[PDB]
Scaffold this active site. Structure first.
Site, PDB file in Angstrom:
ATOM      1  N   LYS A  43       0.818  -1.209   0.000  1.00  0.00           N
ATOM      2  CA  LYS A  43       0.000   0.000   0.000  1.00  0.00           C
ATOM      3  C   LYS A  43       0.843   1.246   0.000  1.00  0.00           C
ATOM      4  CE  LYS A  43      -4.288  -1.578   0.001  1.00  0.00           C
ATOM      5  NZ  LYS A  43      -4.126  -2.857   0.690  1.00  0.00           N
ATOM      6  N   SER A  87      -2.764 -12.680   3.875  1.00  0.00           N
ATOM      7  CA  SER A  87      -3.074 -12.593   2.444  1.00  0.00           C
ATOM      8  C   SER A  87      -1.891 -12.992   1.567  1.00  0.00           C
ATOM      9  CB  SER A  87      -3.523 -11.170   2.070  1.00  0.00           C
ATOM     10  OG  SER A  87      -2.402 -10.297   1.990  1.00  0.00           O
TER      11      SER A  87
END
Lengths: 309, 309
Positions: A44, A266
């Site tokens: 991110k 994830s």
């Protein structure tokens, strides 16, 4: 490498690492892109920087303005370190059901946190952020709608994969949160380099929204948003693959145990998908690239580590 | 970058970031090298990889042998991911004061932990590890003695600084734990590039052993070992500088807050020293480089985050 004038400029340039034991007995090659190695330690960071830079260019964000976004996870961390490096006031809205440690990280970068009633969940944090963002002097990046999100992966992540593999990438497998990673990489490979590549989106079997099923609860933080994001371009995705929560958790544990790669839940989901794809006979001798979004130390309080007290 | 055949090959190539607000009003230039961006997120990844590779080339380490090392933090983590990546049994000795989060990180890589009396510190860990290493089939890297430790800094860290600054480094400031970082970078710049560099060793004011004072307890983990390591070469160091635990903790908080660099306590120690040196008249218009060894999330349970509950 250049000298980076602030920490936001240092995004990306992450390494590709070949997977050796989880691929034992396969004839394909599986390479993991370690997005944990970013200025604030997740994928991110790329879009936190890009969305701020893009708002500067367009005039939507000017010095002295206030940045606001509804987010608990890695996007809040990325925006926090970028706003700290570049000098913007930052507010993040999140339901009060937020871990005290994730908040400490956010407050270490000096972000102001606005807790919204835990009952209203994420939609409550979004409503408060929209209300704050409506006032003049406040800017909202909108991570699920902002085209600057997939564009930075077109400009950085995509080319890094292309060049580090020297043009040998036949499959790209990525978990889908906002979908900017898989969209930008697929756009770069398919449209800019005209490269054939089989592109696989990974979602939680408990919330198989990209395949048209209903949203549900799941533990694979960062993916399975519960809707199809506008930043996800289905036209460059060739297959949707779901993984169970336990597959994801266990494969993240095996990535640390068997490869020396400390990564989050994830990451296990993406790798668990990638390794199934990599076992298909049509990909014998081919190269499978997947992305591991962040690092294991961010998950000490989660189900990832519950087997270690 | 190449494709890394395992995660240990991916060490280094860390970014240099200009520090802007903590330097406001100085005419010098302070550049921070971000060693948190390493395969297991600290500077020790360089020497965990290097000492294992060196032992393989020399025959001191062979397939099936058991690695053992004493550690109080990052060297254990580095060896743990390298031994997982490369397939060695690993046992680490450490004082029982090692935090639960550190233990869990080491266990996630499958290392065995042997706890030594907390009040005996590193020396009690070193002794139990030497005991264990006597066994045939066991190998001990010895981070405080092994020349492969400063050598990897001669080969990677030094050249990275030289290349990214294009030969513009007038001051090098580094905290000393094993001393390999400062020894290797200083040897490279002075002995191999024949470059005039003022080299500054940083140690805790509360344990100024390098300066010949008495060992004492302190909270700047990773430095102030309580003895002078063999891997610390006094002939390449020009100055010893002490900093208080308070300086270090606060400056690490200011790096996150004012620069968006999430880093550990020893990082604030090095920067606190680098900023003092950089304010000196003799270094106006000059370039000061310092090392920030690891990342902020490793320190959530410590005094670094005490002010955020």
């Amino acid at each position: 490498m250049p000298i980076f004038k602030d920490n936001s400029e240092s995004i990306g340039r992450t390494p590709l690492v070949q997977i050796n034991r989880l691929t034992a007995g396969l004839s394909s090659r599986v390479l993991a892109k370690i997005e944990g190695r970013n200025p604030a330690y997740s994928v991110k960071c790329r879009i936190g920087a890009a969305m701020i830079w893009d708002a500067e260019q367009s005039g939507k964000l000017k010095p002295g303005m206030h940045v606001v976004e509804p987010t608990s996870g890695n996007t809040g961390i990325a925006l926090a370190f970028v706003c700290a490096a570049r000098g913007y006031k930052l507010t993040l809205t999140m339901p009060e059901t937020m871990s005290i440690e994730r908040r400490m990280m956010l407050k270490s970068f000096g972000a102001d946190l606005v807790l919204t009633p835990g009952a209203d969940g994420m939609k409550g944090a979004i409503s408060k952020a929209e209300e704050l963002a409506a006032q003049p002097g406040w800017f909202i990046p909108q991570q699920f709608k902002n085209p600057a999100n997939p564009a930075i992966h077109v400009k950085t992540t995509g080319p890094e994969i292309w060049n580090d593999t020297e043009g040998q990438v036949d499959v790209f497998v990525a978990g889908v949160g906002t979908g900017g990673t898989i969209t930008g990489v697929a756009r770069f490979l398919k449209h800019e380099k005209k490269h054939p590549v089989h592109v696989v989106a990974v979602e939680p079997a408990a919330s198989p929204v990209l395949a048209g099923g209903p949203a549900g609860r799941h533990k694979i933080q960062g993916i399975g948003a519960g809707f199809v994001p506008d930043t996800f371009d289905r036209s460059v995705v060739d297959e949707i693959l779901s993984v169970t929560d336990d597959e994801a958790i266990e494969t993240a544990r095996k990535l640390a145990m068997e490869e020396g790669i400390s990564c989050g839940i994830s990451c296990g989901a993406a790798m668990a998908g990638a390794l199934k794809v990599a076992a298909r006979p049509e990909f014998a001798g081919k190269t499978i690239v997947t992305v591991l979004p962040d690092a294991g130390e961010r998950y000490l309080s989660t189900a990832l580590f519950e087997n270690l007290r």
